[PDB]
């Protein structure tokens, strides 16, 4: 007999108490941006027939950016409640470590765990760490920094690898990072976050109080 498998080694799967801890209407007035993220992730997951009605091939990845504290990670937590996906959040800091070769393999450990599983969301928290080539490193231990991007590109827009994998990233100022990331087909969506303005200080003061 074959036992039910586990795939249980490096678990970050926020599933079934506890993913959510938040509802969708908790965020105060990101209405352009709550509508925009929903079009790329929540909408193709359920109403997939609309994209096939036109032949769109719905977009793969979304890049969020803004000042530190404009409600970025809260929006990622708000998706995890009202989705039926396998939400995976990964900090962009535990693979810039020592032990040469472990860094690029942890990128493989995520996607082999992802593509074996359900329609899933891969939320990389910060890549205001390593995201930029911009020079040829004629040094040591900087090409190891540089090649994690090369492994990230190979399993993002390498072969087909198509079915129901979504990637969300979040940073500060986006002019720093690699232009090889910013081609559409890989990072189709660019969303900018203002701080608030007026009419948004009212909405957050209302909902908290």
């Amino acid at each position: 007999d074959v036992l039910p498998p586990e795939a249980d080694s490096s678990i970050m799967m926020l599933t079934s108490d506890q993913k959510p801890d938040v509802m969708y209407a908790d965020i105060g007035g990101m209405d352009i941006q709550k509508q925009e993220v929903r079009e790329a992730v929540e909408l193709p997951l359920t109403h997939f027939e609309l994209y096939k009605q036109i032949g769109i091939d719905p977009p793969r990845g979304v890049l969020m950016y803004g000042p530190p504290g404009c409600g970025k990670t809260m929006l990622a937590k708000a998706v995890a409640h009202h989705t039926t996906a396998a939400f995976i959040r990964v900090v962009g800091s535990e693979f810039v470590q020592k032990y040469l070769g472990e860094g690029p393999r942890m990128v493989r450990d995520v996607f082999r765990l992802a593509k074996e599983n359900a329609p899933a969301i891969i939320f990389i928290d910060e890549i205001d760490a390593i995201a930029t080539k911009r020079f040829d490193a004629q040094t040591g231990a900087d090409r190891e920094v540089q090649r994690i991007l090369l492994e990230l590109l190979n399993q993002m827009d390498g072969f087909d690898q198509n079915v129901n994998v979504k990637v969300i990233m979040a940073t500060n100022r986006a002019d720093t990072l690699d232009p090889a990331l910013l081609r559409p087909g890989r990072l189709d969506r660019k969303i900018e976050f203002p701080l608030p303005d007026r009419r948004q200080k009212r909405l957050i003061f209302s909902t908290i109080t």
Binding site: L50, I54, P184, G185
Partner: peptide, 25 residues
């Protein structure tokens, strides 16, 4: 243009019809 970003034009133009509940482009 790069050529790969011709798809990004093709996806985002058809995306404008999706938010309008329209199939006409």
């Amino acid at each position: 243009a790069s050529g790969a970003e011709v798809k990004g034009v093709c996806t985002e133009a058809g995306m404008y019809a999706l938010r309008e509940r329209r199939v006409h482009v």
